[PDB]
Design an enzyme around this catalytic site. Structure first.
Site, PDB file in Angstrom:
ATOM      1  N   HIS A  18     -10.329  -1.616  -1.253  1.00 38.91           N
ATOM      2  CA  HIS A  18     -10.508  -0.755  -0.195  1.00 38.91           C
ATOM      3  C   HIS A  18     -12.089  -0.395  -0.376  1.00 38.91           C
ATOM      4  O   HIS A  18     -12.554   0.446  -1.083  1.00 38.91           O
ATOM      5  CB  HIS A  18      -9.729   0.430  -0.659  1.00 38.91           C
ATOM      6  CG  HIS A  18      -9.746   1.591   0.544  1.00 38.91           C
ATOM      7  ND1 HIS A  18      -8.832   2.395   0.833  1.00 38.91           N
ATOM      8  CD2 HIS A  18     -10.878   2.185   1.047  1.00 38.91           C
ATOM      9  CE1 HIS A  18      -9.200   3.315   1.608  1.00 38.91           C
ATOM     10  NE2 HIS A  18     -10.476   3.280   1.889  1.00 38.91           N
ATOM     11  N   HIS A  68      -6.044  -2.598   4.706  1.00 37.85           N
ATOM     12  CA  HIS A  68      -6.664  -2.077   6.038  1.00 37.85           C
ATOM     13  C   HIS A  68      -7.850  -2.918   6.583  1.00 37.85           C
ATOM     14  O   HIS A  68      -8.685  -2.739   6.489  1.00 37.85           O
ATOM     15  CB  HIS A  68      -6.945  -0.788   6.086  1.00 37.85           C
ATOM     16  CG  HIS A  68      -7.596  -0.243   4.980  1.00 37.85           C
ATOM     17  ND1 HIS A  68      -8.834  -0.699   4.434  1.00 37.85           N
ATOM     18  CD2 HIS A  68      -7.058   0.521   3.900  1.00 37.85           C
ATOM     19  CE1 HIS A  68      -8.916   0.040   3.299  1.00 37.85           C
ATOM     20  NE2 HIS A  68      -7.968   0.852   2.906  1.00 37.85           N
ATOM     21  N   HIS A  93       0.921   5.075  -1.845  1.00 39.29           N
ATOM     22  CA  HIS A  93       0.385   6.157  -2.580  1.00 39.29           C
ATOM     23  C   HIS A  93       1.552   6.858  -3.024  1.00 39.29           C
ATOM     24  O   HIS A  93       2.658   7.391  -2.328  1.00 39.29           O
ATOM     25  CB  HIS A  93      -0.505   7.106  -1.614  1.00 39.29           C
ATOM     26  CG  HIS A  93      -1.694   6.344  -1.133  1.00 39.29           C
ATOM     27  ND1 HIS A  93      -2.826   6.419  -1.851  1.00 39.29           N
ATOM     28  CD2 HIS A  93      -1.805   5.695   0.104  1.00 39.29           C
ATOM     29  CE1 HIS A  93      -3.575   5.650  -1.118  1.00 39.29           C
ATOM     30  NE2 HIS A  93      -3.106   5.271  -0.076  1.00 39.29           N
ATOM     31  N   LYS A 118      -6.816  -1.743  -8.526  1.00 37.31           N
ATOM     32  CA  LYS A 118      -7.070  -1.014  -7.417  1.00 37.31           C
ATOM     33  C   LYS A 118      -8.550  -0.612  -7.324  1.00 37.31           C
ATOM     34  O   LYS A 118      -9.123  -0.266  -8.380  1.00 37.31           O
ATOM     35  CB  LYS A 118      -6.315   0.079  -7.094  1.00 37.31           C
ATOM     36  CG  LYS A 118      -6.467   0.892  -5.953  1.00 37.31           C
ATOM     37  CD  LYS A 118      -6.357  -0.080  -4.516  1.00 37.31           C
ATOM     38  CE  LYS A 118      -6.487   1.178  -3.312  1.00 37.31           C
ATOM     39  NZ  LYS A 118      -7.892   1.095  -2.872  1.00 37.31           N
ATOM     40  N   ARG A 137     -15.836   4.171  12.095  1.00 34.49           N
ATOM     41  CA  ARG A 137     -14.532   3.935  11.750  1.00 34.49           C
ATOM     42  C   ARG A 137     -13.423   4.035  12.700  1.00 34.49           C
ATOM     43  O   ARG A 137     -12.477   3.219  12.680  1.00 34.49           O
ATOM     44  CB  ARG A 137     -14.029   4.738  10.480  1.00 34.49           C
ATOM     45  CG  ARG A 137     -14.667   4.048   9.296  1.00 34.49           C
ATOM     46  CD  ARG A 137     -14.063   4.551   7.682  1.00 34.49           C
ATOM     47  NE  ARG A 137     -13.060   4.997   7.606  1.00 34.49           N
ATOM     48  CZ  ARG A 137     -12.607   5.448   6.456  1.00 34.49           C
ATOM     49  NH1 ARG A 137     -13.202   5.949   5.341  1.00 34.49           N
ATOM     50  NH2 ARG A 137     -11.013   5.657   6.222  1.00 34.49           N
ATOM     51  N   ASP A 171       0.154   2.266   3.698  1.00 36.13           N
ATOM     52  CA  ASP A 171      -0.776   3.236   3.408  1.00 36.13           C
ATOM     53  C   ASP A 171      -0.371   4.633   3.435  1.00 36.13           C
ATOM     54  O   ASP A 171      -0.807   5.498   4.074  1.00 36.13           O
ATOM     55  CB  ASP A 171      -2.205   3.093   3.888  1.00 36.13           C
ATOM     56  CG  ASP A 171      -3.249   3.633   3.143  1.00 36.13           C
ATOM     57  OD1 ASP A 171      -3.029   4.674   2.559  1.00 36.13           O
ATOM     58  OD2 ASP A 171      -4.532   3.339   3.447  1.00 36.13           O
ATOM     59  N   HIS A 228       0.907  -1.135  -0.115  1.00 35.87           N
ATOM     60  CA  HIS A 228       0.086  -0.036   0.081  1.00 35.87           C
ATOM     61  C   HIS A 228       1.072   1.160   0.075  1.00 35.87           C
ATOM     62  O   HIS A 228       1.493   1.754   1.010  1.00 35.87           O
ATOM     63  CB  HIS A 228      -0.930   0.021   1.160  1.00 35.87           C
ATOM     64  CG  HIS A 228      -2.035   0.731   1.113  1.00 35.87           C
ATOM     65  ND1 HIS A 228      -3.494   0.273   1.721  1.00 35.87           N
ATOM     66  CD2 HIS A 228      -2.445   1.793   0.296  1.00 35.87           C
ATOM     67  CE1 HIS A 228      -4.404   1.379   1.087  1.00 35.87           C
ATOM     68  NE2 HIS A 228      -3.777   2.035   0.293  1.00 35.87           N
ATOM     69  N   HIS A 270      -9.319  11.477   3.067  1.00 33.54           N
ATOM     70  CA  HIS A 270     -10.482  11.293   2.248  1.00 33.54           C
ATOM     71  C   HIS A 270     -11.508  12.485   2.257  1.00 33.54           C
ATOM     72  O   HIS A 270     -12.424  12.175   2.218  1.00 33.54           O
ATOM     73  CB  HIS A 270     -11.283  10.065   2.651  1.00 33.54           C
ATOM     74  CG  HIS A 270     -10.713   8.820   2.494  1.00 33.54           C
ATOM     75  ND1 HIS A 270      -9.890   8.227   3.693  1.00 33.54           N
ATOM     76  CD2 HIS A 270     -10.136   8.085   1.395  1.00 33.54           C
ATOM     77  CE1 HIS A 270      -9.197   7.092   3.215  1.00 33.54           C
ATOM     78  NE2 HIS A 270      -9.430   6.901   1.980  1.00 33.54           N
ATOM     79  N   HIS A 329     -11.141   1.426  -5.035  1.00 31.29           N
ATOM     80  CA  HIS A 329     -11.395   2.239  -4.161  1.00 31.29           C
ATOM     81  C   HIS A 329     -12.846   2.409  -3.871  1.00 31.29           C
ATOM     82  O   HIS A 329     -13.581   2.602  -4.765  1.00 31.29           O
ATOM     83  CB  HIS A 329     -10.627   3.549  -4.089  1.00 31.29           C
ATOM     84  CG  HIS A 329     -10.114   4.056  -2.872  1.00 31.29           C
ATOM     85  ND1 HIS A 329     -11.051   4.652  -2.300  1.00 31.29           N
ATOM     86  CD2 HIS A 329      -8.981   4.170  -2.434  1.00 31.29           C
ATOM     87  CE1 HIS A 329     -10.138   5.175  -0.928  1.00 31.29           C
ATOM     88  NE2 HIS A 329      -8.914   4.659  -0.920  1.00 31.29           N
ATOM     89  N   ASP A 364     -13.625   5.444  -2.928  1.00 31.88           N
ATOM     90  CA  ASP A 364     -13.744   7.073  -3.648  1.00 31.88           C
ATOM     91  C   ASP A 364     -14.147   6.902  -5.303  1.00 31.88           C
ATOM     92  O   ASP A 364     -14.977   7.681  -5.786  1.00 31.88           O
ATOM     93  CB  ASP A 364     -12.615   7.799  -3.607  1.00 31.88           C
ATOM     94  CG  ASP A 364     -12.220   7.989  -1.915  1.00 31.88           C
ATOM     95  OD1 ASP A 364     -12.586   7.307  -1.197  1.00 31.88           O
ATOM     96  OD2 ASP A 364     -11.545   8.937  -1.914  1.00 31.88           O
TER      97      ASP A 364
HETATM   98 NI    NI Z   1      -4.674   3.934   1.344  1.00 30.56          NI
HETATM   99 NI    NI Z   2      -6.730   2.978   1.622  1.00 30.11          NI
END
Ligand code: NI
Ligand code: NI
Ligand code: NI
Lengths: 571, 114, 99, 571, 99, 99
Positions: D250, D276, D140, D221, D340, D364, D138, D324, D223, D225
Site C-alpha cells: 500500500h 488497490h 482488516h 505488509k 485520490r 479491503d 485484503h 486513514h 503501508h 501509514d
Molecule cells: Ni486496506
Molecule cells: Ni489499504
C-alpha cells in the site's frame, strides 16, 4: 396444630389426593403417594428450614449423601412409579435419592441417601412439575440449531444421523463411513444434547457395517432411498446381534423387493426399531401398521400426523414432494403418494397410542417432522383420545394418570430402552443421570422453566440479564452455564457401541464429551417397553386402507381445535 | 431469450446406451397391493407375486432412463423392455437368490436355477 | 412470554412485512425477500384468524400479480414454504407459484 | 432409446451445448464437455440408482476410492478447465475425482477414483452450479463477525492482519510482533474460515522481520501509514526471498520518499502483491496503475470502486476521511484526497479487468471495502463490460465462458497462487482441498445454498429448525456442523511460513486447527496467474489523470442500474 | 428469502424507526438512537426509491432540527454513516451534522 | 447508536406490540405473548412520556379486560415484570394481575 390445604398448597404445593390440571387439556393427574412426614418440609428462603444447623450440617461432602443440588418438594411424572410428591436429590450429576431431604441429626424420617449440607444449592420444587428429559430417535442432522428448538421443549437427547443440509441427509438419518462418523462425533462437541449416531445399514458384506460399529455408531439405518432389501436388513441385523446395537428401518414403500410380510421374514424375529409405523414418513404401503402386531418390533411414530386434524390431509400431499425429492409432474411420483396420504391409518395411529400398541414417539425433524413440538403433540393427542374414547378400564376412576404415564413413557423411558441407554437416561430413578425438565402445570408439555443436564442447568427461561430479577421481559430462552465452556461437554453424552468404546473411540476421535457404550438392545422386546406391552391381532383392507384391530375398526373423527397452541405460541 | 437462471437447451434428443440387447417381458401384478420397480433394480430378484418369465431376467435391469420407476397397479399387465447391467455384471444383495455373476452367456445360456 | 426460538425468529419476518406493505402503498415493485415476506405473513395471519390450509394456500396465491413485482421475481419463486400455528397445531403452507 | 432434453433437464440437469443464464445478467455459460456415458446417471432419492447393489457396493472404505460425499451431476465453473458437467467426489476432505460416479462392478465407464458405496452421502448436484470458494487477500481483522458476512457470499478463505477495532488495524492489515501474531493465531481457532496472517514489513534490520516469519505469518505488509520507504520494501523483499512468502504493498500516496519510478526500482524486479492498483485505497498518486505493466507485480483491487457507478464519485470524498483519519478542515488532508478521488482510473480499472491485466480481486474490508459482496461485484463488472466492450476475440462466438472463467479466476485460483496456497486450494482439481460453494444459477454470485469446507458443510441456507423441512421461512444463513465443536478447527487451515512450520508453531502456539505452510510465492509471475497473463505498455497523463493503454484511452461511461442488488437484497 | 447477516441486522434498525416516527407524532424530543434511526431509514428508503447519493445526503440533513431533538444530541452527532442498497449496488451515506 | 444488548432485545418486544395492536383492531382475543407485549410497551412508553412508577402500574392494569383476551390467559398471569428507562434511570414495573 392443624391448617387447611389451601394455605399449604400456596406455600408447600400439593400432596396425596390433590389433582393437577395439565394446562388447558381435560387431563387431571392425582398424587398417588407423598414420601414425607408432615411438619418438617424442606424449602429454601429468607428465614426458612434450610439454614446452618437446621437443614444443613457440619459434616463433609465425602460422607456419601451430601447433595450438590435438591429440588424442594416437586410433583414427579415418571412412567415407572410416577405422580408422587417428594424431594429429589442430585449428586455427581446423578439422581442420589427420591424421598425426604434435610438434616437427619435434628429431623425425623430423613431418607439416608438424601441429606442437605454445605454442598447443596436448592431449587424451588413447589408449585412445579419434574420429569425425565425427552429422547428423539428420528433426527436428521440437517442443522445444529435444531437442538436449541428441541431443548426449548424438554428434549435433551438426540438419536439419528447426517452431515448437514445434503439431500442424502435431508431424507435419511445416516452418517456413512468412519470419516463422516468421526467428523460428526467431533462436531457434536459443540452441542448441548446427548447424541447417538446411526450408520448406513445397506450392505451385502459384514465388513462395511463393522467399520461403522468400531467408528462409533449406536446403530444402523435402513432407508428406502438407499435400498431396504431383504439382504440389507439381514446383514444389518446379523451385525446388530454381535455388536449389541439397535437397527432403525424406513422400509421400501414401493413394495419393490417384496411386501410387508416378506420383510418380516427377512427380520427373522430379531428386535428392530420401525420409524413412522403409520406410513406418512415411509414403509411398505398400505399395511405398515401390521408390523406393530409382532413382539420383536419397537414401533415409533413421526409427529406431523399426531394429533389427527381436519386440515392434515391437505398439507402432507405437498410436504411429501420435498423430503424424498418427488416430482409433481411425473405420474409414477404423484400416484405413489396417493396411497401414502391414506387418512384412515392416521386416525388409527392416534387410537393405537391410547391402546398401548405404538410403544414410542419420535419426530423425523426437517423431513416430515417437528423437533420443538414433541412433548406438546404427545399431550395434544392425550386430550383428543380422552375426549373421544373416554377413560380406560386400567385407568383409575377419578384421575387420568394411567394415560399420561403411558404417554410420557413414549418420549422418556421407551426410546431409551430401544436404543440401549435405559441405565443411563429414561426415568427419574436412583443411580441414573440427572437429565431432568421443570415446567409449571399451567405451561406443561410446551414451555419449561429449566432444563437440568448432569446436575447443571443447560437451558432455561430467562429475562433481561441487565435487570434486577430473572423474570422481567423480554423472556426468551438462552444457553445457561450447563451449555458454556467445558461444562457443556462434561454434562453431555456421546453414545457409541461397546466395540468403539473398547477400541478407544474417546481417545482416537478425541472426544472431551462423556462417552457411554449402548447395551441391552437385542434381548429386549415389546413387553420390556413400559406401559405399552400390547401385541394385538391385526386385519388391514388393502383397497380402501381400512384398519381393523381384533375384529374392530380402528379410527376416530378429526379435531379442528387442539390443546395448547395459539393460546401460548406466537408464530 | 430465457428467464433468469434458465437453460437454453439445444434442439436435439438424448440417446440412451445403444448396442445392448433388449428383452421384452409381460409383467402382471397378482397381489392386491401396488408395486413400483426402479431403473437399476435386478428383476430376477423381485417379489415372487409378479408372474413372468423369471429365467429371462438373469442380470438384466429395466430399459428406461436412470432414476425413474414405472408403477404397476393390482392386476394390471404391462410390457417392459429389459437391458443387461454394465461393467463386470457382478450384483449382490436383494433376496440372496444368486449374489454373484450373470455375464457367462457361453453360447446357449445355462446354470443357476431358482 | 417464554418465547421459544421458533417464536423469536418469526418476528424478524413480520418486521419485513410492514416495510413490504409500506413500499406497496407508495407504488413500488417488490423484490424477492419483500414478496416472500408479505406472502408468508398472510399464512401466519390466516392461521391466527382460524382459516383452513386450503383457504390460506389459495389466498396466498391471490395477493400479488406479475405487475406488482420486479421483472424476474416470479421466475425464481416456483414455491413458497412456511409454518404457521393453526387452531389444531403447527401446519405446513406450500404456495406453488403465487405469481 | 431417445427422450427430449426438456424432460432430461427437469431431472438430470443440463449437458453439452446447453447455455445457462447467470441470474439477471446478460452472461450465458455453455457446457464445453460432459464426462459421463448417457444412460447410467447417478442420483439419490426414493427408488433411484443409488441403492444396495446398484450405485453402492459391499466393498470397504479402505479400498481407496469409496467416497465420503458425492455431488450428483453438477455444472462446474473452474478457471483451469471449467464449464463441464460431471460427478465430483469427496474423500478425506479432498477432491478424489471429477467424472462419473457409481458401482464399476455393475456400471460401464465408471471413473476409477470415483465409486459410490456404503460410506457415501449424496448431494443434489443437478439444477445447481459448483465452484471453488473465494479468497480475500485484503482483510482488516477489525471484527470476527466479518467472516460470517464473507462466508454468506462464497468466501471461505481470509488473508490480511489486525488486532481488532484499533485505528492502527482500521487502516492497515498488520499483526505486528510475535505476541500479537500468537494471540491472533489462537483467536482464529474460533473462526470458520482459512486465515493467513500478514506482519508489519517496516524495518531497516533483517531481525524484526525474522521474528514475525518464525512466529507464523504468511507474508508482510508495507503501508503508507507505517512508512512505505524504499528500505522498508527492500528489506521486506530480501526476507521474503529467503522465507518463500508474499509481500503486500500500500505504497506512499504522498510521493514523499519518491515517485512510482522510485518504488519499482526498490522492488528490484522481485514478485510483490499490490493492493488497490486503481488508487482509491492507496498508492503514490496519480500513476499507480502504471505498476500493472511490470511482470513481477501481482495486481489486486478493492471492491467499492467495481462496478463503476454514476454516484461512486460522491461517497469516496467522505469515505476517505475515516479509514486513514484525515481531517476535513486541514488543507493538506483534503487537497491530497482531491487527486485520490480521480474518476478516470476507476473506469480504466473496470476495462483492465476485462482485458486481463488486473489479475485478481480483493476487498479491503471495513476500510474502503465490503467483504460480503466480492463474488457479486465480480459478476456485476462482468455484466457491464459485456454490455459496453462486447465479446472478446478470444471469447467463443456463442457463449460468455472466457469472460466468466477469467473473472472467477480473480477470486478463486489467482489469489491462492499469489499467497502460495495453490496446491491446497484455488481450483476444483483432483488432490486439492474440498473448499467448495453451491448456488442456483438464479442466485449465482450473490446467495449460495451451501458452503462445503474440508468435505463438511460449514455454512448454508436454512429455514425454521423446528419445521418439517429445511426450506420454510424465515430462511436466514446459520452455522452448520462444519462450524461446530472440534470440526470447525479440523476443516479450517491456519496458513503460516515454512520457517514457522519447521520451528513448530502448531505445538508452540497450540493450534488445534490444520496448519499448512505457504510455498512458491517468489518464483511465480504474471504468466503463472490464470487467464490474466497480460503485461501491456502504459502511458498516464499526470495533469488530468487520463490513462492510455498501448496508445488507446482506457475508460468507460458509468452505469446507474447494476445486475443483482435490489431484486435479491433487502437492506 | 436467504437473508444474509447484513439484511437480518438491517431489520432491528427499521423496528426503531417506527418507534421514532410514532414518538414524533405525539410530540417528543428524540434521543441519540431514535434520531440516528429515523436519519438512517431515509437513506435506505432513498436508495430503494432510486435517489442518488447527493440527494439522500442533503435530504437526511433536512429531516430534523435542534428543536425536534433533546438538548445535547446535536453536539454528540457531527457525522452519521450507513450503507444502503442503491440501483448500482451498496454505497456509503455520510451525513456531516444533520442538526 | 451504540446499542447495548439490553436495547437490542427491547426491539423484538416492540415488533410484537404492533402485531398485538393490529390484531386488536380486527377484533381478536390476545394470547399470552401478545397480551404481555401490549402490557409491557405501555410501561416503556409511559417511562418515555415521563410517567411515574405509580401511574404506569395502574395504567398497565387498565389496558385489557377478561373479554379482550382468550379463556385462561388471566389465570396464568398473576404478575407481569419489565424494566423501562425513566427520567431518573432504569426502574422495575410489577403489574399484579392486569386482568
Ligand atoms: Ni486496506
Ligand atoms: Ni489499504
Ligand atoms: Ni425418514
Amino acid at each position: 396444630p392443624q391448617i387447611s390445604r389451601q394455605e399449604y398448597a400456596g406455600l408447600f404445593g400439593p400432596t396425596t389426593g390433590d389433582k393437577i390440571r395439565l394446562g388447558d387439556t381435560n387431563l387431571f393427574i392425582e398424587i398417588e403417594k407423598d414420601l414425607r412426614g408432615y411438619g418438617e418440609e424442606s424449602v429454601y428462603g429468607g428465614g426458612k428450614s434450610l439454614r446452618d444447623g437446621m437443614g444443613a450440617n457440619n459434616h463433609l461432602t465425602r460422607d456419601n449423601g451430601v447433595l450438590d443440588l435438591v429440588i424442594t418438594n416437586v410433583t414427579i411424572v415418571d412412567a415407572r412409579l410416577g405422580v408422587i410428591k417428594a424431594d429429589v436429590g442430585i449428586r455427581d450429576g446423578k439422581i442420589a435419592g427420591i424421598g425426604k431431604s434435610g438434616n437427619p441429626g435434628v429431623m425425623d424420617g430423613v431418607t439416608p441417601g438424601l441429606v442437605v449440607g454445605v454442598s447443596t444449592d436448592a431449587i424451588s420444587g413447589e408449585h412445579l412439575i419434574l420429569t425425565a428429559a425427552g429422547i428423539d430417535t428420528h433426527i436428521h442432522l440437517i442443522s445444529p440449531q435444531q437442538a436449541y428448538h428441541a431443548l426449548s421443549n424438554g428434549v435433551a437427547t438426540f438419536f439419528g444421523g447426517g452431515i448437514g443440509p445434503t439431500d442424502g441427509t435431508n431424507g435419511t438419518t445416516v452418517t456413512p463411513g468412519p470419516w463422516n462418523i468421526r467428523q460428526m462425533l467431533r462436531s457434536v462437541e459443540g452441542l448441548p444434547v446427548n447424541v447417538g449416531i446411526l450408520g448406513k445399514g445397506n450392505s451385502y458384506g459384514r465388513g462395511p457395517l463393522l467399520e461403522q460399529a468400531i467408528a462409533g455408531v449406536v446403530g444402523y439405518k435402513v432407508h428406502e432411498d438407499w435400498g431396504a432389501t431383504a439382504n440389507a436388513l439381514r446383514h444389518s441385523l446379523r451385525m446388530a446381534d454381535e455388536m449389541d446395537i439397535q437397527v432403525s428401518v424406513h422400509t421400501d414403500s414401493l413394495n419393490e423387493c417384496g411386501y410387508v410380510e416378506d420383510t418380516i421374514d427377512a427380520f427373522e424375529g430379531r428386535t428392530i426399531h420401525t420409524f413412522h409405523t403409520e406410513g406418512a414418513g415411509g414403509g411398505h404401503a398400505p399395511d405398515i401398521i401390521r408390523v406393530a402386531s409382532q413382539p420383536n418390533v419397537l414401533p415409533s411414530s413421526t409427529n406431523p400426523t399426531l394429533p389427527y386434524g381436519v386440515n392434515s390431509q391437505a398439507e402432507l400431499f405437498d410436504m411429501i414432494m420435498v423430503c424424498h425429492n418427488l416430482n409433481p409432474n411425473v405420474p409414477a411420483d404423484v400416484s405413489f403418494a396417493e396411497s401414502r396420504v391414506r387418512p384412515e391409518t392416521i386416525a388409527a395411529e392416534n387410537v393405537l397410542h391410547d391402546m398401548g400398541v405404538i410403544s414410542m414417539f419420535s419426530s423425523d425433524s426437517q423431513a416430515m417432522g417437528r423437533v420443538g413440538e414433541n412433548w406438546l403433540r404427545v399431550m395434544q393427542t392425550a386430550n383428543a383420545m380422552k375426549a373421544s374414547r373416554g377413560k380406560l378400564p386400567e385407568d383409575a376412576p377419578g384421575n387420568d394418570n394411567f394415560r399420561v404415564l403411558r404417554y410420557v413413557a413414549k418420549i422418556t423411558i421407551n426410546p431409551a430402552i430401544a436404543q440401549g441407554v435405559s441405565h443411563v437416561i429414561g426415568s427419574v430413578e436412583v443411580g441414573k443421570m440427572a437429565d431432568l425438565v421443570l415446567w409449571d402445570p399451567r405451561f406443561f408439555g410446551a414451555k419449561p422453566k429449566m432444563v437440568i443436564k448432569g446436575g447443571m442447568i443447560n437451558w432455561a427461561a430467562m429475562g433481561d440479564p441487565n435487570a434486577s430479577l430473572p423474570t422481567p421481559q423480554p423472556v426468551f430462552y438462552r444457553p445457561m452455564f450447563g451449555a458454556m465452556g467445558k461444562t457443556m461437554q462434561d454434562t453431555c453424552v456421546t453414545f457409541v457401541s461397546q466395540a468403539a468404546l473398547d477400541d478407544g473411540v474417546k481417545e482416537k476421535a478425541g472426544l472431551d464429551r462423556q462417552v457411554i457404550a449402548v447395551k441391552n438392545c437385542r434381548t429386549i422386546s415389546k413387553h420390556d417397553l413400559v406401559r405399552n406391552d400390547q401385541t394385538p391381532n391385526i386385519e388391514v383392507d388393502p383397497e380402501t386402507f381400512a384398519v381393523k384391530v381384533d375384529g374392530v375398526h380402528a379410527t376416530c373423527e378429526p379435531i379442528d381445535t387442539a390443546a395448547m397452541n395459539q393460546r401460548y405460541f406466537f408464530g | 431469450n430465457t428467464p433468469l437462471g434458465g437453460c437454453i437447451l439445444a434442439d436435439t434428443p438424448i440417446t440412451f446406451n445403444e448396442n445392448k440387447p433388449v428383452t421384452k417381458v409381460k409383467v402382471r401384478n397378482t397381489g392386491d397391493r401396488p408395486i413400483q420397480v426402479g431403473s437399476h433394480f435386478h428383476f430376477f430378484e423381485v417379489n415372487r407375486a409378479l408372474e413372468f418369465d423369471r429365467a429371462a431376467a438373469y442380470g438384466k435391469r429395466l430399459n428406461i432412463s436412470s432414476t425413474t420407476a414405472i408403477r404397476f397397479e393390482p392386476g394390471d399387465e404391462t410390457e417392459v423392455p429389459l437391458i443387461p447391467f454394465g461393467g463386470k455384471q457382478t450384483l449382490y444383495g436383494f433376496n440372496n437368490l444368486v449374489d454373484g455373476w450373470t455375464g457367462e452367456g457361453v453360447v446357449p445360456n445355462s446354470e443357476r436355477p431358482d | 412470554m417464554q418465547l421459544t426460538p421458533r417464536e423469536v425468529e418469526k418476528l424478524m419476518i413480520y418486521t419485513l412485512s410492514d416495510v413490504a406493505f409500506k413500499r406497496k402503498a407508495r407504488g413500488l415493485k417488490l423484490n424477492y425477500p419483500e414478496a416472500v415476506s408479505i406472502i408468508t405473513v398472510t399464512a401466519m395471519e390466516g392461521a391466527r384468524d382460524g382459516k383452513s390450509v386450503e383457504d390460506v394456500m389459495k389466498e396466498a396465491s391471490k395477493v400479488l400479480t406479475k405487475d406488482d413485482v420486479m421483472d424476474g421475481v416470479a421466475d425464481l419463486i416456483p414455491n413458497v414454504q412456511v409454518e404457521a400455528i393453526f387452531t389444531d397445531g403447527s401446519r405446513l403452507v406450500t404456495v406453488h407459484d403465487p405469481i
